A paper describes a structure:
The active site of Mpro contains four subsites (S1’, S1, S2, S3) that accommodate the amino acids of the peptide substrate (P1’, P1, P2, and P3). The Mpro enzyme has a stringent requirement for glutamine in the P1 position, which occupies the S1 subsite. An affinity selection of a 4-billion-membered DNA-encoded chemical library (DECL) using Mpro as bait produces novel non-covalent and non-peptide-based small molecule inhibitors of Mpro with low nanomolar Ki values.
In contrast, it was discovered that CDD-1733, harboring the S-configuration, gave a Ki of 12 nM. The 2.14 Å resolution structure from space group C121 has a single monomer in the asymmetric unit, and the biological dimer is formed by the monomer and the symmetry-related monomer across the crystallographic two-fold axis. The structure shows CDD-1733 within the active site where enzyme binding is driven by direct and water-mediated hydrogen bonds and the hydrophobic effect. Hydrophobic effects lead to contacts between the isoquinoline unit and other S1 residues including Phe140, Leu141, and Asn142. The five-membered ring of benzimidazole is directly above the catalytic Cys145 and the N3 hydrogen bonds to the main chain N of Gly143. The cyclobutane methylamide, which represents the DNA-attachment point in library synthesis, extends toward the S3 and S4 subsites and the C3 carbonyl oxygen hydrogen bonds with the main chain N of Glu166.
Author numbering:
A (entry chain B), B (entry chain B): 1 to 305
């Protein structure tokens, strides 16, 4: 029993964290084999942020201009290149602690673990979600650029996020590991802001199934609804449209609890229209939406790796 | 910016997790140097749980009766002993990944990270607190016995919890690393239940300071109260008494935000008497109490290790 915001074990990733210094700027880098990945704005200067030309800034740099420290060892840079908004520094040494890994670009609504770092040293690990508006509600301070987000699917680390910026509202924006930003954001000083967000409906439903698995049943009812009548109520409460694909993904959780997906949707409509009335669900007074169906199965069945 | 339930990086602990098998029972063990620690009820049989005599059960066991698997390597047991409710199996090999470590027995209200494991393999990491009633609200399934809780204070791992049981209400109970249970619980089948719990007041106040640090100010007021008048309101809402020591611990957070502790207490009294009125604090509609003052400073200042 129990349900927590559970992050993946971080050790496989900790062994890859390094420190990259260019001039006065210092941030974190990801050391995989003999390449170090980090945000390309480590090359910028604070006075040249309105519109930096990254190709020009990079041709004027040399291999000795990058200080890469891995713990108590300095790494020698033997080459550099740029891929979208990430900088790739080839080093003369391959990381012996390199895990089995992939680079994945995830969809909004999926979750990952963040290993926040400062000066190459891991500080903490937490779970978060890619919001529908392609921001993340992380916990980041100055120096955390280059921290990565990741998932694990057996022994393979799937990296999916590298941290680049904090927007004015305090949320965060960054790229996949091939340097493509999530959302319409760019690594330059503009008036860009996070758009309006919505609630990840399929995730709320999974978290409701997680509650049933753990003994919370006060919110269920005898009713059922259609996909159309539910999406009409969802859109009124700023919820993501629920697709038939979502209903299919919620299949295994529906069979484990014997509650049909459209039956669970009727409970959700009631909860949106009437609130919780002083009651809580899995220790929350709000409808949580940062648990994917896979997260629920992972925690309520107990898969390792 | 941002505030998350942040766990410590788990890698130092992952390298110590093993699998211990005695007869048909299998649970997790903690491999530090040449000793493997695990719950002593791994020696029991399912039919002899009403009142097992652990001294008798242990004299009838031999070194070959314990199977200790560390990954894809079997460890040879060269001795066994019992310390309170933990079993200590000396192995012929010292763990090369043994970190710098201590064993600490923590106070109710303190937090730690849990690395949940099954069959020796880490599954996930989450934060939790020792409740005033000496239970923890963890996330544990069959096979998670032997998972440990821990803190990090530089490069030293301070182990403080080993998981033993899940009580009827779904909360969990276990021991420190020297085998002494937290609370009045015992590793035998009785009618024991978790006592009535209270809210960790000093932790709520720290989490309120964390909110101010992150831009949430709607709950502040101009008022102040005394320690006595506040504790009179706290006891009415089933909150832990606030001591002068607590007020001293909240010192640095009070100086960073310029809000006096007794001023923050006046905000808390108002929030208890009137609720939140549809508003949230740091993304919660409830008053969170699983953040210690040190956790807040760690996340809002960014210490690593
Ligand atoms: C000084 C050379 C260029 C400059 N490089 C950094 O400044 C920087 C350096 C090292 C670690 C860093 N760690 C962080 C950081 C991470 N997460 C949360 C935070 C919260 C508060 C303060 C800082 C952070 N930054 C800052 C750059 C990023 C930003 O959004 N600028 C508008 C935040 C770091 C930069 C300016 C503007 C941008 C823009 F694209 F947003 F405009 C990007 C980079
Ligand atoms: C079979 C030999 C003895 C027996 N040994 C185990 O049974 C056991 C074995 C391996 C991994 C285990 N992992 C778990 C487990 C951990 N966390 C959450 C869980 C949630 C649901 C189910 C199981 C768990 N257990 C169970 C023993 C503990 C308990 O409270 N019994 C009343 C839970 C494990 C045992 C019975 C009673 C007690 C008592 F002291 F509570 F009475 C203790 C142990």
């Amino acid at each position: 029993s129990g349900f927590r915001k559970m992050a993946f074990p971080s050790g496989k990733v900790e062994g890859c964290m390094v420190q990259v210094t260019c001039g006065t700027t210092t941030l974190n880098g990801l050391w995989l084999d003999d390449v170090v990945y980090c945000p390309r704005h480590v090359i910028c200067t604070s006075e040249d942020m309105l519109n930096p030309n990254y190709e020009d800034l990079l041709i004027r740099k040399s291999n000795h201009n990058f200080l890469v420290q891995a713990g108590n060892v300095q790494l020698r840079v033997i080459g550099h290149s740029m891929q979208n908004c990430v900088l790739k520094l080839k080093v003369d040494t391959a990381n012996p602690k390199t895990p089995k890994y992939k680079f994945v670009r995830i969809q909004p609504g999926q979750t990952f673990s963040v290993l926040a770092c400062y000066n190459g040293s891991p500080s903490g690990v937490y779970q978060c979600a890619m919001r529908p508006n392609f921001t993340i509600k992380g916990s980041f301070l100055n120096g955390s650029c280059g921290s990565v987000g990741f998932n694990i699917d057996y022994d393979c680390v799937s990296f999916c996020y590298m941290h680049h910026m904090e927007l004015p509202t305090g949320v965060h924006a960054g790229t996949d590991l091939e340097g493509n930003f999530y959302g319409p954001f760019v690594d330059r000083q503009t008036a860009q802001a996070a758009g309006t967000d919505t609630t990840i409906t399929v995730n709320v439903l999974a978290w409701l199934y997680a509650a049933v698995i753990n003994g919370d049943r006060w919110f269920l009812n005898r009713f059922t609804t259609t996909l159309n009548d539910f999406n009409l109520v969802a859109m009124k409460y700023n919820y993501e449209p629920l697709t038939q694909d979502h209903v299919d993904i919620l299949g295994p959780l529906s069979a484990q609890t014997g509650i049909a997906v459209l039956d669970m949707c009727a409970s959700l409509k009631e909860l949106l229209q009437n609130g919780m009335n002083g009651r809580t669900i899995l220790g929350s007074a709000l409808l949580e939406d940062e648990f994917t169906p896979f997260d629920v199965v992972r925690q309520c069945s107990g898969v390792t790796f």
